[PDB]
Structure formats: C-alpha cells, structure tokens
C-alpha cells in the first residue's frame, strides 16, 4: 500500500503492534502512531493532520489535540502544534511518528488525514485505543 | 543534572544497544543516537551540538555533519541542520534522538557537546561506530 497507519505500544523497549481495539492497555505505556508514506506518481507535497480525541461520557476538549504538518520538497514543515512529530526516510519510505502516552481511562482515537494536489483526499485512517 | 549518550542499532525491529567501537556493522543499518537529559533545578537554557565525522585514510568533508539545537524556556529550538532531530519527554528526562544510517566503510564518530549559562560546559561524550 502507498499509505499505512499503525499504533505501537512500547513494551520492554520494543515496539509491539496494537492490532485490536478489544485490548485494554494499562496506563503509563508509551505509544507511537506511525504514518508510512511510499511516494510515487502524484504523491509528493502533502498536507497532513493528526486528530487525537477521547470518547464517552467524560469526553473533554482538554484531551483533544490536532497535529498539523506539511511535506514540501520532501521536507517536514511544522504548521501547528506539531513539535512532537518527527519525519524519517527509510528506503524510499517516509515515516511520520506521533508519540503519546496512556493516561486516561476509556476510548481514545487518533485519526490521520492526508491531502495533496489542491486538497484532493489521498488517505484517511483512524485507530481506536482502550485504556484501563 | 545528569546526562547519558547511547547508540542503538535496529536489528529485527528492536533497538539494540551498540557499545562504542564494539563490532563492525554492515551497511544499510539504521542507527539512533540518544542524548538523555535529567534536568536539575536552575539548569537554564542549553545549547547542544552533535558532530558526525568519519576517520581513516578516506576521511571526507562531505560526510561530516553538525546538528545544532537549543533548549530555551523548556522547548526545542532547531538552530542549524536539525530537521531530523526529535525530542521526546519522559518521566523526569528529555531524550534527543539523532537518526543515521550505515553507508561508508570505516570508523565514524558522533560527538555531543552540551553548554548552558555563559557557555559553561555541562557535558561532552563521543561514540564510535565501525562499518564494513
């Protein structure tokens, strides 16, 4: 696939794929959300946003974050609230990493939206995480 | 204030600690150099530079890089050639990560220099890597 979106839990200094919303995670785990981009025809300069939200009765705007970046000339441009993001190039693949930590009980989602060529939608995905 | 400086090689999707000049690595391996900062009280703003150099009969200026960052008011400031650097905040320590790839045969070093108030030297360390 040209785009991929994954959540990893840091366990004993290894990244372990989080592959089911059914699995409750304990608090105090580091998470990494990874957007992998394989460039090609029509895929170069991009606008990307990550949307972190929590859900349920105790939904709070306080826990909401948007991380907005652009990729221009294969370089990362921090647009808004994107200081913790990082871009890494590995063998024709660009990986954008968003770090988080499990802290509040309940359902949390991270959504990613990728647009290019004057706002054409290239990719959207979302990962839910349950925390004890 | 306490500092640590470590090098990790990615081997089967895990960060494996690479001790300085402890073995020869093949080409096309990913490396991460991590400076960990355990800030003490009144440490003030910091100026940090990483210096990459290669050594031997084929010492080459085109392989040298300097990555310069500051920590000002507890935020990362990318000063020069620091787009690939990232800063992760953990419980009681900051971690600055410098990614590299093994590409040229011989000895290479990554040196880190940390200065603070009045250009006072707080820390210096260096790690060497052998590449096949």
UniProtKB/Swiss-Prot annotation, chains A, B:
Highest taxon above the source species: Bacteria
Region (AGS-C domain), start-end ranges: 2-132
Subcellular location: Cytoplasm
Self-association state and partner proteins as the record states: Homodimer.
Family statement: Belongs to the adenylyl cyclase class-4/guanylyl cyclase family. Pyrimidine cyclase subfamily.
Other notes: T5 phage that escape Pycsar have mutated major capsid protein pb8 (D20, AC Q6QGD8); infection with these phage elicits less cCMP production. Ectopic expression of the capsid protein in addition to both Pycsar genes does not induce effector-mediated toxicity, suggesting another factor is necessary.
This protein's domain notes: Has an N-terminal nucleotide cyclase domain and a C-terminal nucleotide sensor domain (AGS-C); removal of the latter leads to loss of phage P1 and T5 resistance.
Entry function: Pycsar (pyrimidine cyclase system for antiphage resistance) provides immunity against bacteriophage. The pyrimidine cyclase (PycC) synthesizes cyclic nucleotides in response to infection; these serve as specific second messenger signals. The signal activates the adjacent effector, leading to bacterial cell death and abortive phage infection. A clade E Pycsar system. The pyrimidine cyclase gene of a two-gene Pycsar system, generates cyclic CMP (cCMP) from CTP in response to bacteriophage infection. Has little to no activity on ATP, GTP or UTP. Expression of this and adjacent effector EcPycTM (AC P0DV25) confers resistance to bacteriophage P1 and T5; expression of this gene alone does not confer resistance. When cells expressing the Pycsar system are infected by phage T5 at low multiplicity of infection (0.2 MOI) the culture survives, at 2.0 MOI bacteria enter growth arrest.
Protein name: Cytidylate cyclase
Biological classification of the source: Bacteria, Pseudomonadati, Pseudomonadota, Gammaproteobacteria, Enterobacterales
